[PDB]
């Protein structure tokens, strides 16, 4: 395939959807291709600043996202991750703020927002130094193990693992810290991907900059190994105001790179890098929980 | 944040930060937490007869304010205390010696009130052999799996007990396991244990008796339930002591607490900003140990 870029630059769409009546924001997207169409799950914020979740109706082209249905989940699955777990032929939805520190549900009908199984434990542990507690999971496998990565709004990235034959199931309560920095430099919204054909993994993490939210990147040769800084500063980031080509938003915030293969390896084609991110109008302000986040798409330049 | 521990320690120091109120001769064995952005310090007292009790200080924002903070006597003593917030059950804990059990604890939702604590409960009900004092100087620390009790015996040993985190608050029982052994003077008392922020590592400090005064030695571990390895191991190159403190008002660097920013049961220290609230005494002081004029000072890494 293609090696990761040494230096990142992008072009952007404008906003691709707006929240339906009774909602103020669409956040934290997770995307898969399902039956040749785009299947997107995400969080919601309502007029009171309370968080829930949803999916979009299946849509073929990004220009059609604005007319897709917005389907409210009856029990919330905030900051979701969706993937197909191939060894047991089942789709997985992982999330925070449910009955366990992280939870999951299963389905064979993932286009139905309300077709998921009863919640099961994904992780039951704790962290310290945090105003939020554990936040923003992702889940990724290799041929031997499944891995859980997450954040804490506290400058740390955490990891747990289990044998692949034990999944779906709980990772337990123990974790290991894999990265540490200032709170603003490693804040939240971590994502991890297999770089197709390159024997390498990509991690991206949301940071708080002087000029907006932006992403930093790291690389590894194994999911249980060391993470090395790649695009590390606000002025030369993975994706941010400095290199996004987006003028409708300053923020490039919590979302998902575009994955074509929907399986548990979270594989990206680095010949065709694209980023489904949350942004907000440059004129927006006030209460964080009421900010009008909505989706946009970056394509490498 | 996530700095590695230093390989080698050296410090600068304040002078005395506070002195005992009328009727007391010493303030000893501090335990500190941040409570709503302010410094909350508990400690032992020695009175004009050399008898031991406990107290807290009024809440204060800056170390320069400690000398004018109220000194609030506890109606029932909690000698050599440990204070922390037990997050899983949303409650503050005060652990201590010389009460109704070998080690005891009380609970509170109002920890700034010296006399607002619940009735005493058992923390530990065992004994140790070959000690002139019996069990002394507890601390309590958790990870994601278990809570741990560490303590000393004025006898060259450090002791450990443990329980599942879901069983706490409760008693650790009566059994203990010896994790370190040396001469009485090399591993004497005033043990403290901390999580090194971001490092997947733990730090233990222990008070020792040197030629030139009291000083601290250090150890590290990769798991709280595992083996402890010596780090700073001599009086001339200590964790903290006369050799490296930058303090001239005191020779002793004795029983206190590293500065913890997060108040919870993990006892986390930010190794980018190491500071030590220690007990010291005037260089011209002397005589009976129980009457010594111990009082607080603060080290900052140099
Ligand atoms: O949108 C809900 C939370 N907001 C910050 C974090 O990235 C999300 O989990
Ligand atoms: O200050 C009371 C005791 N004195 C020695 C020991 O470190 C303390 O528990
Ligand atoms: Ca996410
Ligand atoms: Ca102590
Ligand atoms: Zn930190
Ligand atoms: Zn003040």
Residue numbers in the entry:
A (entry chain A): 25 to 325
B (entry chain B): 24 to 325
In the authors' words:
Xylan, which is a major component of the plant cell wall, consists of a backbone β-1,4-linked d-xylosyl chain, which is decorated with diverse substituents including 2- and 3-linked arabinofuranosyl moieties (typically in cereal arabinoxylans) and glucuronic acid (notably in cereal and hardwood glucuronoxylans). Of particular interest are the arabino­furanosidases, which are capable of removing the arabinofuranosyl (Araf) substituents from the 2- and 3-positions of the xylan backbone, thus opening up the xylan backbone for attack by classical endoxylanases. CAZY family GH62 contains many enzymes that act as arabinoxylan-active arabinofuranosidases. GH62 enzymes are inverting and thus do not have a suitably positioned nucleophile.
Here, we present the three-dimensional structure of a fungal GH62 arabinofuranosidase from Talaromyces pinophilus refined at 1.25 Å resolution in complex with the bespoke iminosugar arabinofuranosidase inhibitor 1,4-dideoxy-l,4-imino-l-arabinitol (AraDNJ). The protein chain can be traced from residues 25 through to 325 and contains both structural calcium and zinc ions. There are two subunits in the asymmetric unit with high structural similarity (r.m.s.d. of 0.22 Å), with some conformational differences on the outer surfaces, in particular in the region of crystal contacts. However, this structural Ca2+ ion (which is close to, but does not impinge on, the active centre) is coordinated by six water molecules and a carboxylate O atom from Glu215. This is different to previous structures, in which the Ca2+ ion was coordinated by a His and Gln pair, which are replaced here by a water molecule hydrogen-bonded to Ser278 (in place of the His) and directly to Glu215 (in place of the Gln observed previously). It is rare in glycosidases that iminosugars bind so well to the glycosidase active site without a close enzyme-derived nucleophilic interaction, but other examples include CAZY family GH6, where cellobio-derived isofagomines have been used to good effect, even reporting on the substrate distortions involved in catalysis.
